[PDB]
Design a protein around this nucleic acid. Structure first.
Ligand SMILES: [Ca+2]
Ligand SMILES: [Mn+2]
Ligand SMILES: [Mn+2]
Length: 430
DNA sequence: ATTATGACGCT
DNA sequence: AGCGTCATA
């Protein structure tokens, strides 16, 4: 009862850009705006691989991982933008730089955790406390929440989407106890006000639209964000969790989309997150381990303590290329030439990183895949990274992998290489 | 023949 | 350390 922790201590948001690489290309090229369009890498093989899709194109059934030739079968008027190619490979610099634009704006409001190229978590607990003091017990107007959905509302005793949104928001605001500076629901609401401001700032200063989730932890914030996309934000309260989770497939929760999630389903014979509540903590720990079990026991009740880490910059800088089917590398000079290409992009990114962010990478990680291996990586070896020089890094990379060549002939490489990967790690301040 | 990443857990 | 899992454009 009174000692039951409810995991309502924090206000956490997740902000995720809408169709991000597509918006970067649509900003650049006005002809692509408000059209079915997608972003593709490479072109020779089946028109290239789709990696981002506008909402207009999704309506035709176009998805990520689809070959553009196949996407065109669903959407004959689909417009395409190509990922840049440099040194023989896809180069994602434009999208990394656009990401920095957004992350720098978000950082003005609070400490952020960069979680991908297009999303960051925000711990708004302190910002909310500050804003609550400014508000002075004054009610929150619906006008301050013009793109916010309250999950689970409206309920109880109009037919268009925006109408429904306002109905739910009204019920929510009508219920709010604004006299209590410590009410979690009030704190979430003020959190949502700030995120409206954050999202307006991102759109004003970059042109990019985004969605967001506001809740008491990262998992719920992420889940909330996806509930009303694009260009909207969703508040998931603690109270909304039982109904929300009662029909929520387990795989939809972050970290449960893979083998662990499948094992939760199979071992326990359940389908929905809410069904987890009927197991003891020890029962869950017995099946899924101490850490996972405790996490599941709290998470199915809407509770999670994973902090928003203060980290705005990626921890590693990597360059990778696949060589599928017949393009697999079978000669030493092939292997060496491509290691050099990767190393040259890596040097360029590392040198920029050092100037921008006052740090230096100290370890070089080299990974390859061999033809036949089911695994994405076959072998991973590290060596020292002492100088930002591509010729040295590629020579060093070759040295640490050259023993994988089973071929009796030095000139030939066997089995052929279907992937190369260079990653700079272990940064130190500089 | 999705590809190019990037964080974190296990032993 | 090297490998595996899970994640996003
Ligand atoms: Ca996104
Ligand atoms: Mn994302
Ligand atoms: Mn996505």
């Amino acid at each position: 009862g009174p000692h039951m922790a409810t995991g309502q201590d924090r206000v956490v948001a997740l902000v995720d850009m809408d169709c991000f690489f597509v918006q970067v290309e649509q900003r650049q090229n006005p002809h692509l705006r408000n059209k079915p369009c997608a972003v593709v890498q490479y072109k020779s093989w089946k028109g290239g691989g789709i990696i981002a899709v506008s909402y207009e194109a999704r309506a035709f059934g176009v998805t990520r991982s689809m070959w553009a030739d196949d996407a065109k079968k669903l959407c004959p008027d689909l417009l395409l933008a190509q990922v840049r190619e440099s040194r023989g490979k896809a180069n994602l610099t434009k999208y990394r730089e656009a990401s920095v634009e957004v992350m720098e704006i978000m950082s003005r409001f609070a400490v952020i955790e960069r979680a991908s190229i297009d999303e960051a978590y925000v711990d708004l607990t302190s910002a909310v406390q500050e804003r609550l003091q400014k508000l002075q017990g004054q009610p929150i107007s619906a006008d301050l929440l013009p793109s916010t959905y309250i999950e689970g509302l409206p309920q109880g005793p109009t037919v268009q989407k925006e109408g429904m949104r306002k109905q739910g928001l009204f019920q929510w605001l009508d219920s709010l106890q604004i006299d209590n500076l410590t009410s979690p629901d009030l704190q979430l609401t003020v959190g949502a006000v700030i995120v409206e401001e954050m999202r307006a700032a991102i759109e004003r200063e970059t042109g990019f639209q985004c969605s967001a989730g506001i809740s008491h932890n990262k998992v719920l914030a992420k889940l909330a964000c996806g509930l009303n996309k694009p260009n909207r934000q969703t508040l998931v309260s603690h109270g909304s969790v039982p109904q929300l989770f009662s029909q929520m497939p387990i795989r939809k929760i972050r970290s449960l989309g893979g083998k662990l999630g499948a094992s939760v389903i199979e071992i326990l014979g359940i389908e929905y997150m809410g069904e987890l509540t009927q197991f003891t903590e020890s029962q869950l720990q017995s099946h899924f381990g101490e850490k996972n079990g405790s996490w599941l026991y709290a998470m199915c009740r809407g509770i999670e303590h994973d902090p928003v880490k203060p980290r705005q910059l990626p921890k590693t800088i990597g360059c990778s290329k696949n060589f599928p089917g017949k393009t697999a590398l079978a000669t030493r000079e092939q292997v060496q030439w491509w290691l050099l290409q990767l190393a040259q992009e890596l040097e360029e990114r590392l040198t920029k990183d050092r100037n921008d962010n006052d740090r230096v990478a100290t370890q070089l990680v080299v990974s390859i895949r061999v033809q036949g291996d089911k695994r994405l990586s076959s072998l991973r070896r590290c060596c020292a990274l002492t100088r930002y020089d591509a010729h040295k890094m590629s020579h060093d990379a070759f040295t640490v992998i050259k023993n994988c060549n089973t071929s009796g002939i030095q000139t030939e490489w066997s089995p052929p290489l279907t992937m190369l990967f260079l990653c700079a790690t272990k940064f130190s301040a500089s």
